[PDB]
Amino acid sequence: LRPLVPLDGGRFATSDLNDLYRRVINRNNRLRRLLELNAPDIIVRNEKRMLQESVDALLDNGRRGRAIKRPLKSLADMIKGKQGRFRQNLLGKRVDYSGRSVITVGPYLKLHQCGLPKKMALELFKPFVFAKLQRRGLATTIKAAKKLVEREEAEVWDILEEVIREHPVLLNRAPTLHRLGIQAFEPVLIEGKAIQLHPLVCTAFNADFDGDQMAVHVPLSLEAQLEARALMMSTNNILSPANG
Amino acid sequence: ASFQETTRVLTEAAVRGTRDNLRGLKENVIVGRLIPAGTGLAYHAGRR
Amino acid sequence: SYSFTEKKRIRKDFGKQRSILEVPFLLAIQVDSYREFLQEDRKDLGLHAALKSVFPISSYSGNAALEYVGYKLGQPVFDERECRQRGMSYGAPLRVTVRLVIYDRESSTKAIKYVKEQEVYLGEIPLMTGNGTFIVNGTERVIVSQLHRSPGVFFDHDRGKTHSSGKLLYSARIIPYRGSWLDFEFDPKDALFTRIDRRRKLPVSILLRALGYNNEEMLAEFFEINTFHIVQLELVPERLRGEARHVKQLEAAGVAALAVPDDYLVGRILSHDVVDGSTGELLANANDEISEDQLTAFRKAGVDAVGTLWVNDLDRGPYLSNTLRIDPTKTQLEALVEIYRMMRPGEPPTKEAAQNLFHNLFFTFERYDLSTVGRMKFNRRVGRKDVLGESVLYDKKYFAERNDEESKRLVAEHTDTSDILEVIKVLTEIRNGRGVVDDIDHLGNRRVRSVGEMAENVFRVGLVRVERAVKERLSMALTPQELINAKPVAAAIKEFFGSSQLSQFMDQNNPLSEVTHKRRVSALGPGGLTRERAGFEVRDVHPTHYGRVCTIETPEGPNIGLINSLAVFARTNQYGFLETPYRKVLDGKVSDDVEYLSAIEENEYVIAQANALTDAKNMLTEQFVPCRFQGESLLKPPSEVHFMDVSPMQTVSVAAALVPFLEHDDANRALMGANMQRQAVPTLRSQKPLVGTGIERAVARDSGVTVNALRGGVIEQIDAARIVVKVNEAEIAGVDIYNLIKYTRSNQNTCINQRPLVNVGDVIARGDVLADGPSTDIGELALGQNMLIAFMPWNGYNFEDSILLSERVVEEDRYTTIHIEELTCVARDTKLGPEEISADIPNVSEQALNRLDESGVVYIGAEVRAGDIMVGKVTPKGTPEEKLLRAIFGEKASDVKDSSLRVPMDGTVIDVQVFTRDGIEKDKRARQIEENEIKRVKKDFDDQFRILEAAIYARLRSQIVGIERAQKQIQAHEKEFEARFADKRGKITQGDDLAPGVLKMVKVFLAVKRRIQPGDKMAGRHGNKGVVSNVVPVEDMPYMATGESVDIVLNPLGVPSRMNIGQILEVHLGWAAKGLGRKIQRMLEAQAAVSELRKFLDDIYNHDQRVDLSQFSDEELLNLGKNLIDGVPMATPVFDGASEAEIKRMLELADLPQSGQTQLYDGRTGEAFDRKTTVGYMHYLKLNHLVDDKMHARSTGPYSLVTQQPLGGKAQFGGQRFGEMEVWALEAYGAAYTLQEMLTVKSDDVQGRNQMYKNIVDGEHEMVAGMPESFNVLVKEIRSLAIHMELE
Amino acid sequence: MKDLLNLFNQQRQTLDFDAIKIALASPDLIRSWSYGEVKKPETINYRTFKPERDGLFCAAIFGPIKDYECLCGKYKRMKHRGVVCEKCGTEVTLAKVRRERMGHIDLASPVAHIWFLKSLPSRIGLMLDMTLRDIERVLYFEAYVVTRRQLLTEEQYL
Amino acid sequence: RGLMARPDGSIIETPIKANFREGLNVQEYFNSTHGARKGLADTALKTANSGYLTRRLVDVAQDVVITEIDCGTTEGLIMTPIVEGGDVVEPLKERVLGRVVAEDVVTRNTLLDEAWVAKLEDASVQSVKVRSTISCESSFGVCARCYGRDLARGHQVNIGEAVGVIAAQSIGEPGTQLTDNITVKTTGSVKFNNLKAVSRSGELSVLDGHGRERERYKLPYGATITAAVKAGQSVANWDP
DNA sequence: GGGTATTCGCCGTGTACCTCTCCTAGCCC
DNA sequence: GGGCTAATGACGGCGAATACCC
RNA sequence: AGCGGAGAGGUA
Ligand SMILES: [Mg+2]
Ligand SMILES: [Zn+2]
Ligand SMILES: [Zn+2]
Incomplete structure (x- = not known):
């Protein structure tokens, strides 16, 4: 849970909990050596005071002692705060099967459909492409199927077009203060590097078209796909959650 | 202890010895079970 | 009268008035501060001041003194390109001459034995490259200026911060340069409190008792004391005014000391004590409330005067009496040990230790060290006539009892200044005499620290560490070279120049960005404020910023106002304050004299604005001029003004002046456009801006990306890589040669290039350009291209700030940019075996091995693709068949691992750089490129020697027309060339510096030329950013009546919303310029005369600033007409000129409509539109935010080991962070099964993602969820806090 | 380091519970939590890539570095499970137990938890009916405690 | 453009x-960029405070x-149109529409539509x-x-709909966009409410x-009222 | 003992993304 | 150069200890 | 060979 990070040349990165643990163990061993020596009361009193201060720096650093140009983290700061283990890894998590790109405007699209790049949809829908290539018989193993995907022939485009036909994706704005910041669309394959969007969608997203990026997510379970079709579609979310 | 003063709520739960019955929405995200709102209400009805 | 660069092309310039003062050097403050810091050429202030301040060292045992006579800076061992390519720092050695003397103990002082250790090595000072940059580990760093609080004394207040009342408290703070901070705070119970370095607050009576002052003396000095009589008292005519006809009658009558009853004496406080020698006891204490028993004792003693204090309600306040009443300490030693206990908590009291601590806290030079600017601010705030003073805080009572040698010199020059009592008295007159306070919002209250002051500060810190080492090292006294250690000062200067908040990575994509980054000031730093703190009071602009700090150049994000930009004519004063020039205005006529006024001197005189009309050459024909007095507008007669602005470009910076029509645009869009111009990318062919300003030439000159001829002459020898000039006899022994950089990467992975523009055999002057730099025209700055604009909605493709592009803007390669990437292959040394660069790699097909050579690396100039192996690298990873295979081969049969360099972005390889270490056998390709480099340096050294010998022989042939010095000069040049060739050969034959653990490094330069794609961010000139929607063919674009197809179709809906209309005037001026260029091309296409072109240029240049056409030549006029065949560029000043009548006249001069709106037809159906649209040429550029950098996706990549979650970022295949607000939105949807499979199955669970992946690739549907591993991490982290958390 | 046979099996943990209980921890329960005692503040020895015995990074207390491997190398097979090596004492088991097992420190003198003292609703101050400054002076070795509840200066104690 | 603040x-x-069509001086552009910097800092702190409040x-x-679908609560709440002394804040047709009624005004426990609002x-x-x-x-629910x-x-x-997160997100929507004499303006009949002038709380509705x-x-207290009252007049003139 | 009156701390202050550098280095040979 | 080697330019809301004459 | 803590710049 507290690993060491190596650098180039054999060096290791400094740690916060390991230095506090080494200080506590060293002061405890010094207290044991002073107790075995039968030291007078002043020396063992100062050693017990240093042991109490090192335990205080180990448990909650920065409250009374503030052990160090920058104060290192402790067990109390690793739980609380914004950068702790509770807000960065439990409420908000990094997810796979996801990517982001810039957005342009597409007037030829419908309300329920949106655009998606070819290489982006090939990277996102790669397990379904592998499963369909195993089912069609074009490759016996997944290594030959992966080499056929990276070779980029026309059959992988046929597989990617047949997979993406009835599979919705979750388009998300990077601020999500709105209730309708996440909407489901049926993507199509376009010959570009951006994500085309309907002009009636960016009003609810409050999104412009100058350097705006939108992260996409693909649901892969059947329950998630049916939930995205039923209660996340852009054609079903017409009214606002604030007023009528 | 989710948004403010984690140490105070943690030491209060440590002294009193409370028992979290998981009857909420955020604690089901923390534990990893289904949300008891919408499609997950039938699972909570069949569990109890 | 005109140079060759101006004779090449002349742009039309119209305005209201001419410019008096020219544009100065834009990077002058950094190079002048570094020249004052280095003192390379005396040496009163700078590094020599710190060297003279630190190096006098007195040991504890005596007979040890260190002296120095000077310092010398050595030459750098490498070139600038050598440190840029090899990775070294462009530094210079600093050598001092430490003189060590030894005195004789137990005798008189005498120099028994003195030594002088010359060339004491300490540190390496990185020198500037002439433009404000220095190479730190192969990268160029720019140290920006800091806008901090100036040293001195300030008086602030707090409005409702304490006591929840309407009354306000005052605070006095003494800010030193390198000492401990002193404070003086009030109290709501009318008391004074002080604290040192934000410690626990103490009353000022303890500090005044530790200084050595008595209560009677401070009560006689602060409060005016009256006398009494034995009861009666003296009559004061001024004291009766507080209690107008009665005071006037008492003044005109002239009364004596009248009698007063005892009812007026009970309400007073006794000033001084009274004693009686006959009684033997004190009848009354000093500073006490008078009682009846004390009055009876004073009447029995027979005292004459008991003393009183002038106490009022608003005019006077008894604060020192309450301060003495609060503090019970009446002993100087008790006050000293109380101060020592407040400074160091938990220590036993010691007399001489606390005395030495109080002496070293405030009253020494080694610890406090108040600067001269702080002394000047102190004397200006208090009100003393003298400006320069002592560098240490002086007291009248503290230095009177000292027995030191410097104290007798200090007490003779100051003559009882008593600055502490002066500060307390000035604060008392602020509280009581109704004085004004000053907030920290002026440019005179702030100060600018350049790179030299911070470098001197960190060098003084390193010298203090070296002195603290040498004070212990010289305790037993050998050579002085073994005492001074270079390691702490070298580590301090490396930690300063390498990793600091003021030394950041610069940007070199644009010359304008380079100029505005070298000129940028920043309020952040070690002494500055934090961006996270509430700083609304300093983010808003102050009226002192007019003329010194640019107001509209401000970055977006958290730092809106903390990161400012310096103005054009603004410079730094001698004390660090900012100054701006003005014009000396006499009564009536205005003299054209330039006087740089400071920020604290501009408010005293009435300064008129630059928008003042003048009928004569220099007069004032307005009865009420728009002048300012205290930063606000005012209407004053012209007989009372004293100063006026020199130019309307004084307010804006160099990045805000280049955008035309600033007076017609909004402030927010101008703020966006001033920041959007710093992110432009240089294209293949750069075009001049049709609507410019005139400050582009100064920015291109002071940017440093172009070369300039120092001495004019013949350019008969010219190449694409080098330019050889031949100077004349007036400027000169050898001729000058300029080497041009062709293709090297910048700090932003862009390509810089220097293409020449002069021809063979043409005379020049001093200052003409010889090669246009990157994103640079023939002497103007060029950021983008010129293209047709139509403001109309086109089928929703330009819906909300979207940009429409044609096929003609893509097929002619107008926005094609060159990007150079750096890809390295590092071969480390492992414990199992060193990694080789061999080409024989197993499990690799021949299709990826044809481009590899026998060396294992790729050739130069090979078209590679994504995933191609450029450098083949293998590493050893460590049955009888394996033993048979190992015995059949030479111990290289198996047990190897493939780890080679691959391309992540397809392009050609332009350069392959191979770095090797000593003791390693070089490769045949490394030997071949070594032969290539030595052949290249032999060839260009032979060419330079042949050119120098030809110049010397030409001078000798010119000298023998009508004899020995030319031969000696040729011999010296041959010896210098031989020494330079020997230095280069010894430099390029040895192994370079590498890390401990690496044997070989191969760096491959990959140059990619990317085209324009739909989705790329492209902004204009006035702040109208956009994203390309799609690429449309030419047949669908709308066409005019003549057949010209519009390239870009913009949206006119942003004009009333964003409230900028300067782009419409820029479009109209570009349309007029393109019409003039087409008319010039139509005139020069047929056989025309010179007089028609002359009268046409005289019609389009001036109309009645003044450009004469009968001056240069006929062939120069034909060259000007050939240069103006693409368009006639116009110059528009930033706050004057370019009215509507001038634009309408330039439109009506050609065959163009007056309103600028012509009717164009649609290209899709061939029909005509209902209205006429605005068509014209706008200077449109391309930003650096590409679509390839932002588009990325992943299915399954690597995971972290602390928690089982994917990584982040575009590198290493990071996943997108599913934030908390998205989880809130999905919980608002309901969505239990969607949220369960998002944060448990896909991300957190180890077995769950494998089960889901195999259920996807198998076809069955069986989802089994589990607990996240981060919850187990949180449980194990809670259990480490001795708190039991169980899952029941 | 690399293991592929153990990686294929799944459904090992059910993760089915009803409630979460949080309470204090007795020292006997903390002693029953851990598997070993640390004694030396040495993590990784110099000039070799091997963990230090009885340190913060140790194999005898938490788990082995490589999967199904010891520090010396006497057992290099997946069939050996639940066996402790003789030279360097560690169990030949999975390398994922280093993330689960923990250790403990035997302190020579007892210390006070800062989460029960430094908080403004102080629990030790309410249980002993004492102010915060008195316990702050006692725990930082500045005064004495009689054993009824009053402060004592060392001279007053003398 | 008028005065600057x-x-x-x-x-x-x-x-x-x-205006922007003609030229602007430097002293006017200084006040313009002052207001622009003030507005930028204002919307930055507004965005931060809106995110924290959300x-x-x-x-x-x-x-x-x-x-549950039904509880059986007959407590109720009285809905009145909100007038703050000027224009109406929320009328009856917006505040009433969307909820069921408690007492018979209509049938209880009936959802109101636009036709019921038009009938009322x-x-x-x-x-x-x-x-x-x-x-x-x-x-433990609504x-x-x-x-x-x-x-x-x-x-x-x-x-099963979580009506708490939707409500908090809808309240947290516009946070980035935030910032004697009784003379009537509109015509209509005046009806006194809680009057007896000896009145503690008086409403001139x-x-x-x-x-x-x-x-x-x-x-x-002690407001003199002069008074089918037309507009442009004062019912209560003054009460110092 | 018991009410105001300051007063020392405790605890918090938007999200998402993209580039770059630099990491404990010091010493007596 | 070489291999171990243990500052003091934030700001607002809020519950809890001192001071003290009646 | 994968797992990271600060500092700086930029976009929405
Ligand atoms: Mg935008
Ligand atoms: Zn073993
Ligand atoms: Zn109900």
């Missing part, structure tokens, strides 16, 4: 007598889940008892009838032709 609160004595309101109201406007009703969520008798109708769909709210209340002014 300074951040300390004082208005500049001279305005900018020039997070706090989400974490406060997250346990309310629609669990034709009947000229002033106050109707409504069923709100502040008076509920459910166990009843489906006390909440009314959904906001995304026009029908009844479904069982008026009734228009359709039956809605447009103006409602406060009346102090």
